[PDB]
Amino acid sequence: MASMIVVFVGTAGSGKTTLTGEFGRYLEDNYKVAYVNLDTGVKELPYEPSIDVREFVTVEEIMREGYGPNGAIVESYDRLMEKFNEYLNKILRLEKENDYVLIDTPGQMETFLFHEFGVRLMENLPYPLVVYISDPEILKKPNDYCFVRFFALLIDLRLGATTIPALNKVDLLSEEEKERHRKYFEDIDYLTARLKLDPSMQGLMAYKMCSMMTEVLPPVRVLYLSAKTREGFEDLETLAYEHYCT
């Protein structure tokens, strides 16, 4: 009815499948929800998918053809393209009968960013919203913050869909960490400022870069989520609905 699509994008250990699971249940209180799994090499799902590409191809079976692991992943998404139109249509249909279609993407994001299947699928859905989750562990140095927010800018460019930067597993944060990440993230002044202290080509090649005063809506609002405590779920829901309007 409301027909929103939310695509979770992240690398290994970001926890996006658990998030897709739990954020669904959260939504299943006030909304009809659909689950789509595009990962051909995930062992188990904590939700019940209306679409599961493992039903057509899996990485493990393909490897049992003599493919290397890197080669079976790529080859698994080559075979999916034979069922491109089907899935696009499976998805478009689901989107007509639901408030939310949650799309769980390949564990290796480059399989989604670089392969025809993921790229073309995206191109052909109406205004999908993308949520890019990062493992807060990566957030050790000041450049790490600029990168996260640049990567989300690309995903946007590559998939042509608004992309929301998010940290997940924030329940594991000491709260000092919690303190530290927000500062760099929300206080654009703080971040840029700090980037000068680096006397290095990367402290120097990395400062002119966080040009917030650029683009349009230069700065993006970073969500902090937790599958575990349902932190930030209402923000995301508010962000979905609001993207659906604008």
Ligand X SMILES: Nc1nc2c(ncn2[C@@H]2O[C@H](COP(=O)(O)OP(=O)(O)O)[C@@H](O)[C@H]2O)c(=O)[nH]1
**Residues of the shown chain interacting with Mg ion in the complex, contacts defined by CB under 5 A:** 17, 42
User: Should residue 205 be labelled a site residue for ligand X when binding is judged by CB under 6 A?
Assistant: no
For residues 31 and 150, which CB has a smaller minimum distance to its own copies in the complex?
A: 150
Inter-residue contact 168 to 180 (CB < 8 Å): no
Inter-residue contact 164 to 131 (CB < 8 Å): yes
The window from 14-22, 58-66, 140-148, 210-218 that contacts ligand X (CB under 6 A) reads 14-22
User: Should residue 108 be labelled a site residue for ligand X when binding is judged by CB under 6 A?
Assistant: no
**31, 49, 52, 71: which one binds its own copies (CB under 8 A):** 71
Closest Cα to residue 80, out of 103, 107, 101, 58? 58
The residue with tokens 């000068």 is 196
**7, 19, 59, 113: which one binds ligand X (CB under 6 A):** 19
Closest Cα to residue 100, out of 190, 37, 32? 32
**29, 174, 175, 208: which one binds its own copies (CB under 8 A):** 208
What values do phi and psi take at 217, rounded to 5?
A: 65, 40
Reduce the DSSP state of residue 132 to 3 states and report it. strand
For residues 40 and 168, which CB has a smaller minimum distance to ligand X in the complex?
A: 168
67: which DSSP letter? -
For residues 33 and 72, which CB has a smaller minimum distance to its own copies in the complex?
A: 72
What's the min distance (Å) between Cβ of 40 and ligand X? 13
Question: Could you give the CA distance from residue 75 to residue 124 in angstroms, rounded to a whole number?
Answer: 22
Burial of 144 (0-12, 13-18, 19+ CB in 10 A): middle
Contacting ligand X within 118-177 (CB under 6 A): 168-169, 171-172
User: Should residue 111 be labelled a site residue for ligand X when binding is judged by CB under 6 A?
Assistant: no
Write out the residues near its own copies by the rule CB under 8 A.
11-13, 39, 41-43, 59-60, 63, 68-74, 106-110, 114, 135, 138, 143, 146-147, 150-151, 153-154, 156-158, 160, 162, 200-202, 204-206, 208-209, 211, 214-216
